[PDB]
Design a protein around this ligand. Sequence first.
Ligand SMILES: CC(C)[C@@H](CO)Nc1nc(Nc2cc(N)cc(Cl)c2)c2ncn(C(C)C)c2n1
Lengths: 280, 244
Amino acid sequence: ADQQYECAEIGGKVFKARDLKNGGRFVALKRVRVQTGEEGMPLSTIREVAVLRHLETFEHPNVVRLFDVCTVSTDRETKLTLVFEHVDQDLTTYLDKVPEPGVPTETIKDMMFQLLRGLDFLHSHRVVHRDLKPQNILVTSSGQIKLADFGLARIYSFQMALTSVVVTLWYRAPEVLLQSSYATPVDLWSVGCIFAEMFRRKPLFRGSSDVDQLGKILDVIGLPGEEDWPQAFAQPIEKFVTDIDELGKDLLLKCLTFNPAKRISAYSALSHPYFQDLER
Amino acid sequence: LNRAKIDSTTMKDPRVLNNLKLRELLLPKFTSLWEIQTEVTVDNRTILLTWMHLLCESFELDKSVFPLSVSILDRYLCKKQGTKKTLQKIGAACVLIGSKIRTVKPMTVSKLTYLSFTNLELINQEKDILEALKWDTEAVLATDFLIPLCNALKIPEDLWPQLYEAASTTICKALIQPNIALLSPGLICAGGLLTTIETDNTNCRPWTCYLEDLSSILNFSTNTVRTVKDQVSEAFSLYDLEIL
Ligand SMILES: CC(C)[C@@H](CO)Nc1nc(Nc2cc(N)cc(Cl)c2)c2ncn(C(C)C)c2n1
């Protein structure tokens, strides 16, 4: 029994299915569990849906597209299906399957360009995607980038409260690990770490715990002076990121800057001399 | 516990203001408030928004829950019908949706109920609101303009804490009044700010000196700014718990 669509899975739970409305196309169905007698609709979902609905007249190429929400309800609970466009691959599986010497560096440039643009869009509408990781970055067959999963995103406003919990530890910024205020820079940290994970086809900061996490970071980035600290615990980045070209290293460090106030932004990163040699 | 600090990307970028004005042009052109309604009137609105307001103020929700919960309410009541004997349930479920989106610790059902129907009835009302608006719940809030306007009028960052604090309180109370619903969020905000700058000027230039500029920033006429300053100020006066 599958309504209007033809659904044992590909990842509540996500499924690959077709539409009987259109000429027999392809959609991504997100089934969401909504426990009976609780708080109503999940916090996470309302936020996600609202962002994507709010910005969909901007038809932006680098954000995933939402089509519909199911809602379907005596004995049954709520059944939340969300139909999205299907994208063939996430970044993770992509990186895994790419034949040898890894991904061609031209792909590394253009994909990173596309990612930074997705972000530049979001932040200029005051939205912070606080959950960038390779599983959340989707790639179309024309090598095209699509940010996904917006269930932790929100419109930022001055003096608003924050949970001290955002991003998988592996991609978490120091701001969050140190339990401080965090904002847009949190996305560029992920960018810094995805940019590395691309060249080297393995995560850059992997730990068991938050303290551990924070340690492996200061391992590379170095321990910066008091000025940039808001008495505990460099080796040039090229040691963990071989195959990186000189101009990419400057961007990489720029995003992996400890002090959040001094980090590179999506807008001006897009104009860092690294992308200069693109094709357009 | 942690609060959002100054983020130049989100507050100082000239084009954030630009996009706010643009996304403002999305929501509907309100000629006549609640016009599709047979029972409930505008007088009802003022009581319910007074309660919805109290609720946010009393539970200490982020300054932007209330504006959004007002937006959701109006939008929702362009589409489905409300009855006087159910208006409270509707407004209750707007604050629920709102708090769930613009605040870190949402309001719970077991808290709006006991303080006002059973929970399933609240939950079904959340479910009916959402699906009527097709889950398009977000919106430009008068309150989103505050900081971008401050930056553009080149007010020194040092004053943003206090100014933000006073002006959002001022904006959130004004929004109770019927005649405020029809104004564009940027104008409501402009007005909130001028009012604030006036009463307690406090190491800050006189309201006069910001009119000409807001006129150019927002792209309205100097007269329609001066009128909205006075409208917000009056709306703010009209606040009265006695009315519940
Ligand atoms: C594990 C899986 C469920 C994740 C990928 O992180 N989600 C995912 N993955 C996708 N793509 C994908 C497709 C295939 N065939 C394989 C892999 Cl690994 C990812 C998607 N294409 C559209 N969506 C919706 C949620 C926007 C997608 N969501």
